[PDB]
Amino acid sequence: IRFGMGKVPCPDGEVGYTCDCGEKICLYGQSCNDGQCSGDPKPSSEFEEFEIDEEEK
C-alpha cells in the first residue's frame, strides 16, 4: 500500500484507519478538514500486548 498519492482518502471527520487527507497522512485517531489534520494519535488500545492462545500444556 502506497500512501501520499491520495490512493487512500480519509473520510471527513475522525479517520478510523490510517489514511491520507490533503497530502498529509492522518494517523488513526484524528479528524481532517480538507488540507489539515488535527488530533491526538494514541489509539490501537492502551493495554499492552500479551500471549495466551490455545496451546494448553
Binding site: 500500500i1 502506497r2 500512501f3 501520499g4 498519492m5 490512493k7 487512500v8 478510523g16 484507519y17 490510517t18 489514511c19 497522512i25 494517523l27 488513526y28 485517531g29 494519535p41 489509539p43 490501537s44
Partner: protein, 259 residues
Amino acid sequence: IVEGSDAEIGMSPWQVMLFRKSPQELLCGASLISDRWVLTAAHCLLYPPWDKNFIENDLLVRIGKHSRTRYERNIEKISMLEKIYIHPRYNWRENLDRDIALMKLKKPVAFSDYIHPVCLPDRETAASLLQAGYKGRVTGWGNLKETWTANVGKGQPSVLQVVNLPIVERPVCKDSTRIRITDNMFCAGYKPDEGKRGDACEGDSGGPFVMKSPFNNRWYQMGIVSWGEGCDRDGKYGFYTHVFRLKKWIQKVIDQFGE
C-alpha cells in the same frame, strides 16, 4: 519497480504473481517458500479502505513467470488456492503492522529451473545480514514509477524488474515518516546523498526482499513489500515486513495445517 532493470530468466524462481480471476489483473507479488505454500503481504487480501476481502476462490497463483502478460505455455505453472491465513494481529489501521499472510495451494507445485523456493532466515543469518548498509534485492512487476506521461501507458513494465536497495537504520526510517513504526518493520532505499536510487511501488507489494548469504551461497527472504509513501520519493523510505520476527507464526500455521 522504480529505477530498475529487466530481470534474467530464472534469477528469481520464487517470485509468484497473485492474479485475480475476474477481472483479470495483477494483484500482488509473492514468494514461494515450499512446494505447497506461498508467502505474501496480508494487505493484498484484506484492506477495507479499498473494499479488499478476497476468498481463496478468487485468486490464482502464477508461478515461474517472467513476462507480465504472456502465457508462458510450458514454463509457468498455475495453482489454485485451497486456503488463506492472514496474521491474526494484522493491524491495517494505525500502521499496517504485521502485514503478512500465507496461502496454501490445492496441489503441490513441481519445481524446475524456473520454480524454486527461497529460504526463510534462520537466526545467525538474520542477525548477520540485517544491518544498516547491507543490500537486499526486490523483484516485481509493479508500476515502473509513481506517475509519468500518458501516451505509452504511464507505466507497467513488460518483464519482471529488479532493484537492489540498502537497509536503512531504524532512527532514519522512524524520522522519515509520522506513521507509528514498529519493530516488525524495516526500511530500505538510498539516502538523498547517494546518486543511486530505486524503490518498490504499487503492484510490487507482497514481493520478496531477498538477500544472498555469503556464509552459504543461499538466498534468504528478509522482508515483504508492505507500505511506503509514493515511490522513489526524495526523503521517504519503503517499509518491508520483518519476516524473521513473524517466522514463529509462519512455522506454526504450516506445522498444524500440513506438515
